[PDB]
Design a protein around this ligand. Structure first.
Ligand SMILES: CNC(=O)Cn1cc(-c2cc3c(N[C@H](c4ccc5c(c4)S(=O)(=O)CCC5)C(C)C)ncnc3[nH]2)cn1
Length: 167
């Protein structure tokens, strides 16, 4: 868990302008969070990037999990292998508001983080999931009580998020 160059926002929430994949390779965290969908199809964005860094081993393991257990719910999660990126991957489904899912489920999505002491994570429901990223950071700070290191791969968004937190 050798996180470097993060800015501490609260006693348990840290943030960095970084690619989560590159952070996972450098840090070797105990848990890396995936911004998953309910059938664990890692077809693009953050999930596609984490899967590609495992050379597709994450997708094969995810398909086997879904075959035995069925899909996740929106706001839910499952723990699978971290492969070469972490000890464990926590696959968390935040709401996709561009697809009509309720933004209120973002609190349930972050609540999954509280079962793990230390996590490297992306900003849930941001990007093409359509949630307002400043609102996602607020829900994270209000909901997560364990130690979370957020990697946001965009300096423009990073700067807006830090400015919003420090108002
Ligand atoms: C040349 N191809 C590539 O760059 C592929 N490639 C993408 C990455 C990569 C993207 C990324 C990231 N993006 C942020 C984000 C946060 C949450 C969600 C999304 C996006 S989404 O995937 O659109 C939908 C699910 C929720 C946005 C807001 C800057 N945040 C951290 N680490 C990240 N790593 C590496 N590689």
């Amino acid at each position: 868990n050798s996180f470097s160059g993060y800015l501490k926002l609260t006693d348990n929430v840290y943030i960095k302008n970084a690619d989560i994949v590159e952070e996972a390779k450098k840090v070797k965290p105990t848990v890396v969070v995936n911004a998953a969908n309910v059938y664990l199809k890692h077809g693009g964005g953050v999930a596609g990037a984490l899967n590609k860094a495992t050379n597709n081993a994450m997708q094969v393991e995810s398909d086997d999990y879904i075959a035995t257990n069925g899909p996740l719910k929106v706001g839910g999660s499952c723990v699978l292998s971290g492969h070469n990126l972490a000890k464990h991957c926590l696959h968390v489904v935040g709401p996709n508001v561009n697809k009509g899912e309720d933004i209120q489920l973002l609190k349930s999505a972050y609540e999954n983080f509280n079962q793990h002491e230390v996590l490297l994570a992306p900003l849930l429901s941001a990007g093409i999931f359509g949630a307002d990223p400043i609102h996602s950071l607020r829900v994270c700070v209000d909901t997560v009580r364990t130690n979370v290191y957020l990697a946001v791969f965009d300096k423009n968004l990073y700067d807006k998020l830090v400015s919003s937190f420090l108002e």
